[PDB]
Structure 1
Amino acid sequence: SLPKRIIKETEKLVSDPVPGITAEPHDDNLRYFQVTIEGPEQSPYEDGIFELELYLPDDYPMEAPKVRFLTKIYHPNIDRLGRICLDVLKTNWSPALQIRTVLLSIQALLASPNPNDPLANDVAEDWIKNEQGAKAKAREWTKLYAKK
């Protein structure tokens, strides 16, 4: 039987959604969600909508949700496979946290890329030394890969 906690979190996600984010169980399985996050206003991502897949593993909430961008995105803290570099998704996760907590952090990360992070990918240098060019590329990629 499906854990009560998952039913309760899902209901809250669909009944009172966070601004800019949509989360809906993919088909009848409540462990698989399709999530969209609007590109933050005043960011290179402002003209698009980004799609992410989120999975609740069998040991959730003791294990963190698994999340990945489906949409290709040019950002220093999101790799080429759409994996997100945040501690809350790794070592700092705990049952005290909720799915909503993670989506809020991801949305904030889009608005505040951190190229100085020691784990940033190779676009980090471009973002730091040629920011106008880096932001322009991020806007072009939004046009090319994100939903309008």
Structure 2
Amino acid sequence: DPPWKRFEVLPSAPVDHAFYNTPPAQHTRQFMARMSKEYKALQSSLPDSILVRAYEDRTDLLRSLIIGPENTPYEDAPFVIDWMLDANFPQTPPIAHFLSWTNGNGRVNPNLYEEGKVCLSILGTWAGDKSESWSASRSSLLQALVSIQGLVLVKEPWFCEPAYEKLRGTEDGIVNSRLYNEKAYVLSRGFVRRALEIPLGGLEEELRWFYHTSGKLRKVLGDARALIVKSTATQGDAEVPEADRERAVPRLSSGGIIALERTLGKLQALQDAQTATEA
């Protein structure tokens, strides 16, 4: 009944799930009691910006949706991860397959690979970042999901690359952070397009409610169009205006404008179809 429920168990894993064709393993006797604790934590503590779906028929598969936070290149865009808990969960970390709707352009974040890999210590896939290593007694799916939102979908993701952290504040790191954020912003807009063009199993009504009923597609379109005007006004300038400092995405290049307007045609076409169906 609620249009935006943070945690729900649905009847059936969707056929579009990344792990739909991997048959479910047996799991230990303690697995189901552990999932009861995991569900209780998701229901109690997921923020409004993270949806999770579990399934009655596949107790080893989950799908999550994270909305990009405000004043990041990711703002208002949907990030979907398909999850598997293997036979050894929770001894072993959950397995993440990120849906990278990047079309060969590269990564949308240094830790979110185009083939689906998520590099975080809490997923057992990276050594020594600010997310803590996985362990059954400390860790949870909830903690994994808030680590992605809190440590990956950040304001200046270019520094998620460990080598580059030493360059904060420097003239080159500032320039490269802006260049990176311009690209992540344009690519993230394409994530809104993909999530709405191709119905996502178990998340169709939620996405429609967020982008249509609650007005976030209007916001995405308005923000992009306002950014095209400001980018046209400042296309030459050697330095960004003072009020636009501290903005995650202060301006776009000419090629980014064109790229963004390609996506706006598809996003406006989605709004137009919705406005039709309401007549």
TM-score, structure 1 as length reference = 0.81
* Consecutive unaligned residues in structure 1, runs of 5 or more: 119-126
Corresponding residue of 1:124: none
- Within-5 A mapping of 1:116-127: 116-118=161-163
Corresponding residue of 2:221: none
Corresponding residue of 1:3: 32
Tell me if structure 2 keeps the 8 A contact 1:68–1:84. Answer: yes
Please identify which structure carries the higher strand content.
Answer: 1
Q: Which has the larger radius of gyration?
A: 2
> In 2 relative to 1, CA 29–78 (structure 1 residues): closer, same or farther, beyond 3 Å?
same
1:131 aligns to 2:177 (yes or no)? yes
- Within-5 A mapping of 1:19-58: 19=47, 20-26=49-55, 28-58=57-87
Corresponding residue of 2:190: 144
Structure 1 stretches of 4+ moved >4 Å: none
Q: What is the number of equivalent residue pairs in this alignment?
A: 140
Q: Structure with the greater relative contact order (CA < 8 A, sep ≥ 6): 1 or 2?
A: 1
TM-score, structure 2 as length reference = 0.45
Percent identity of equivalent pairs? 27
Tell me if structure 1 keeps the 8 A contact 2:78–2:191. Answer: no
The separation in 1 between residues aligned to 2:36 and 2:65, in whole angstroms, is 20
CA-CA distance at 1:39 after TM superposition: 0.4
SS at match of 1:60: coil
1:94 aligns to 2:125 (yes or no)? no
* Consecutive unaligned residues in structure 2, runs of 5 or more: 1-28, 102-106, 128-132, 164-171, 196-210, 212-279
SS at match of 2:153: helix
